[PDB]
Amino acid sequence: GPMIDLYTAATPNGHKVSIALEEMGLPYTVHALSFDKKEQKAPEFLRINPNGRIPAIVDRSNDDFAVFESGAILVYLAEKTGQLMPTDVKGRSRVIQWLMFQMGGVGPMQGQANVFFRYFPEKLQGAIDRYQHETRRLYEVLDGRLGEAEYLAGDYSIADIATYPWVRIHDWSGVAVDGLDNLQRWIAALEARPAVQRGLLVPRR
Amino acid sequence: PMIDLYTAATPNGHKVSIALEEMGLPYTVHALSFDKKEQKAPEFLRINPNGRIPAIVDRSNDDFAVFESGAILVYLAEKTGQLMPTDVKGRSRVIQWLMFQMGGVGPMQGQANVFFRYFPEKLQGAIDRYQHETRRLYEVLDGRLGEAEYLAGDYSIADIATYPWVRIHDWSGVAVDGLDNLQRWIAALEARPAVQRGLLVPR
Structure with missing residues (x-):
């Protein structure tokens, strides 16, 4: 088993x-x-x-x-x-770097967008804006990186795996991916796996 | 250098x-x-x-x-x-507690700082959310520190990641009262x- x-x-x-x-x-x-x-x-x-x-x-x-x-x-x-995840010093670290960007940045910030946009008992537009704007800013960092490399750490890795389930639900969070051509490419590639x-x-x- | x-x-x-x-x-x-x-x-x-x-x-x-x-x-x-140990289990314990800090303590206490200290409007529901969650995470740390001297066993990068946040708990408006294991660890870290x-x- x-x-x-x-x-x-x-x-x-x-x-x-x-x-x-x-x-x-x-x-x-x-x-x-x-x-x-x-x-x-x-x-x-x-x-x-x-x-x-x-x-x-x-x-x-x-x-x-x-x-x-x-x-x-x-x-x-x-x-x-x-x-x-590569085994050499630099390849491994690149994966850990983008993994940490997800764990400390994308996930927490987009999760707080979810809280204030979808679940919180009252509508606090200042908080909603804070986390939706921050999530979009993080998405733009991802998009720029994805113009330099096909996946976040170069070859496909656990960093992409950690990030995709959050990016996938952007509309639930009220955050757009429009205008981010590289992120959109990466979304389509991940979704097709x-x-x-x-x-x-x-x-x- | x-x-x-x-x-x-x-x-x-x-x-x-x-x-x-x-x-x-x-x-x-x-x-x-x-x-x-x-x-x-x-x-x-x-x-x-x-x-x-x-x-x-x-x-x-x-x-x-x-x-x-x-x-x-x-x-x-x-x-x-x-x-950080080099064996599979020792290394993973450090990574686990490091991730708890990076995905949990840091983000949540940081949001407490935002709404308690820096945000333009006073949003009491948001202050409470993040002060309550930060305290809940501190209680998780305190429970773990009752079974190990440091978060991953021996002192490691997981403690170094976590202490600069716990250190400023009062700035975030979060108390450590009642968390005797956390307080022991705070004193050990402060002395190093x-x-x-x-x-x-x-x-």
């Missing part, structure tokens, strides 16, 4: 990891942790991720080693398989 | 100066003014296209640029062999000579 257990949900951060597993050809078992039933607050899950959030993996081939944080899981799996398509359907709705 | 550091007196800048001081690597400091719009200067955009500090240029490695504080910490740890040195950079 699969030696990776995946705890996930249908969110951009969960899709980062299912896409990566699908790209790498790694078998895995899915646990769609039930937030409806408070499973993320149970002691059992908190021994895997003390933050009580998805995604998280348990590597059963490695003494049931737990890995939390989507970006840390991507690094762990890339290193395990030798795929989707079978492994991306499969990863986006995990966990089954 | 080996490393050229482009920085400012912010928590994210302090992560990297603290790391350099811990590792004993020679470096030069370029302090960038947010007022003079030095972040926007084209030469700096060639180093970090995001136009933010910190960034390094490794003069010992073909003037290779590294941006993103967390990625700089990883690059330097790997370069020197310090402050290299932490003290790195907090002085830039002047």
